[PDB]
Ligand binder design. Structure first.
Ligand SMILES: NC(=O)C1=CN([C@@H]2O[C@H](COP(=O)(O)OP(=O)(O)OC[C@H]3O[C@@H](n4cnc5c(N)ncnc54)[C@H](OP(=O)(O)O)[C@@H]3O)[C@@H](O)[C@H]2O)C=CC1
Ligand SMILES: COc1cc(-c2cc(C)cc(C)c2)cc([C@@H](C)C#Cc2c(C)nc(N)nc2N)c1
Length: 157
């Protein structure tokens, strides 16, 4: 299975200057629960904003750099190598990868942040006329999670 895993706001912002615009601990639990024991595929810039691989799952980084080597990170060099990865594979970022993958994915796991942030990175446009709502669950507000957010699981028509 090939899925997108993404958090984006009301205008589809996903990033500002190598950072997530928002601080949402609930969405990071959701990412852990969802992708533990599986594979995360990310572009080189996404990997570098994080800085280390996330424990307890395959970290796959797409890049053209033949020197690129990091402990605990497998490297791929074309979009086509993604389809050769065994298991449940989550496209984890960033903008350019989503742009390349959005038409090919089975499945989308979207956290909609009900806010409007300044950003420089965006998730590509999409219509619900292409996606069925498998589930929509409101995240719970908090001292720690202070921004409204909804977990969507969309599957392609
Ligand atoms: N929520 C998120 O996922 C977050 C993402 N971002 C940001 O996304 C921003 C914009 O960069 P963006 O390009 O969208 O991010 P990516 O993470 O997708 O990194 C882009 C790089 O991925 C590699 N890549 C993508 N497609 C291919 C391909 N088909 N073949 C070979 N290599 C490929 C290239 O790496 P290379 O040049 O090494 O070959 C490319 O330059 C960055 O500033 C990053 O910080 C910021 C915060 C959060
Ligand atoms: C700038 O710093 C970053 C840190 C992390 C990160 C670091 C640790 C230690 C754990 C976790 C779970 C995430 C991830 C990202 C980027 C790659 C992301 C993301 C993303 C999110 C947060 N939510 C959903 N739903 N999908 C997504 N693709 C950027």
């Amino acid at each position: 299975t090939l899925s997108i895993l993404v958090a984006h706001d009301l205008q589809r912002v996903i990033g500002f200057e190598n950072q997530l615009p928002w601080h949402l601990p609930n969405d990071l639990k959701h990412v852990k629960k969802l992708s533990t024991g599986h594979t995360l595929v990310m572009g080189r810039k996404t990997f570098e904003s994080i800085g280390k691989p996330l424990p307890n799952r395959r970290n796959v980084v797409l890049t053209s750099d033949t020197s690129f080597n990091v402990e605990g990170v497998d490297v791929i060099h074309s979009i086509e190598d993604i389809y050769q990865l065994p298991g449940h594979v989550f496209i984890f970022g960033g903008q350019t990868l989503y742009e390349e993958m959005i038409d090919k994915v089975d499945d989308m796991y979207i956290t909609v942040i009900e806010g409007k942030f300044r950003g420089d990175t965006f998730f590509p446009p999409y219509t619900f006329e292409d996606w069925e709502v498998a589930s929509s669950v409101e995240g719970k507000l908090d001292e720690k999670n202070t921004i409204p957010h909804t977990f969507l699981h969309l599957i392609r028509k």
